Structure 1
Amino acid sequence: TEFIRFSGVVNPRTISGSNSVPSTQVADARIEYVGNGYINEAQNMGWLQRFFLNLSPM
């Protein structure tokens, strides 16, 4: 599953025509596009590799 969530503050004067406003005109833009399942799990580093990345010298 994919979750696309948006949050922000919109001035009720930049809304143009068909109730549409570009995200660049929204203050406090919070945009999340996350996924689940093994497809998302395959994009995680892995505990040992993450530890080496954060601690291993060079």
Structure 2
Amino acid sequence: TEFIRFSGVVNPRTISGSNSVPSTQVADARIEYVGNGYINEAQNMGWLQRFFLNLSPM
């Protein structure tokens, strides 16, 4: 399952005639595109590898 979430503030005069506004005209734009399932877990680092990436000398 994939989730696309959007939030922001829109000026009414930036909305086009077809009730559309580009995402670059939204003030506090919060855009999120995430997923779950084993596909999403396959894109997470292992805990040991994350620990090393954060605490290894090099």
* TM-score between both structures, scaled by the size of structure 1: 0.98
Determine which structure has the larger strand proportion and give its number. 1
The answer for unaligned runs of 5 or more in structure 2 is none
- Quote the Cα distance in structure 1 between the aligned partners of 2:33 and 2:45: 18
- Quote the Cα distance in structure 2 between the aligned partners of 1:43 and 1:7: 25
The alpha carbon displacement at 1:17 in A equals 1.2
SS in 1 for 2:52: helix
SS in 2 for 1:21: coil
The alpha carbon displacement at 1:14 in A equals 0.2
The answer for unaligned runs of 5 or more in structure 1 is none
Aligned-residue sequence identity (percent) comes to 100
Runs of 4+ residues deviating >6 angstroms: none
Output one character per residue of 1:14-56: Cα deviation in whole Å (capped at 9) or x when no partner.
0011110000000100000000000000000110000000000
* TM-score between both structures, scaled by the size of structure 2: 0.98
